[PDB]
Amino acid sequence: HLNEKKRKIYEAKDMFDIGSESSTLLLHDAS
Amino acid sequence: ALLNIETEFTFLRNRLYGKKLLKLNEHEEMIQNE
C-alpha cells in the first residue's frame, strides 16, 4: 500500500510539473 | 515575467514532491520501525 501510494505520488508530482510548465507557457503567451 | 512564474510553479511542485516523498519515506522507516 505504501509502495502504491509512493508511485501515485511520483505520478502526481510529474503531472504537477507538467501543469506548472503549461501554466508558464500560457502566462508567457498572455504576455 | 513568465520565467519567474515558471520558476515559482516549479518550486511549488518540487516542494510538494519533496514533502510527499519525505513523508512516504518516514512511513516506510516506521513500517520497518513497527
Q: How far apart are CA B12 and CA B19, in angstroms?
A: 11
Burial classification of residue B34, based on how many CB atoms lie within 10 Å of its CB (0-12 exposed, 13-18 middle, 19 or more buried): exposed
**What DSSP assignment string belongs to B10-27?**
HHHHHHHHHHHHHHHHHH
Question: What is the largest distance, in Å, between two alpha-carbon atoms of chain A?
Answer: 44
Header resolution in angstroms = 3.2
Which residue, chain included where needed, has cell 512564474?
B5
Q: Are A19 and B12 in contact (CB under 8 A)?
A: no
With vertex at residue A28, the alpha carbon angle to CA A23 and CA A26, rounded to the nearest 5 degrees, is 35
Q: How far apart are CA B24 and CA B12, in angstroms?
A: 18
Q: Which helix (H) or strand (E) holds A19?
A: helix A2-30
C-alpha cell at B19: 514533502
The contact set of A with B (CB < 8 A) is 2, 5-6, 9-10, 12-13, 16-17, 19-21, 23-24, 27-28, 31
The structure was resolved experimentally with: cryo-EM
Instruction: Answer whether A16 sits within 8 Å of B1, measured CB to CB.
Output: no
Q: How far apart are CA A1 and CA B20, in angstroms?
A: 15
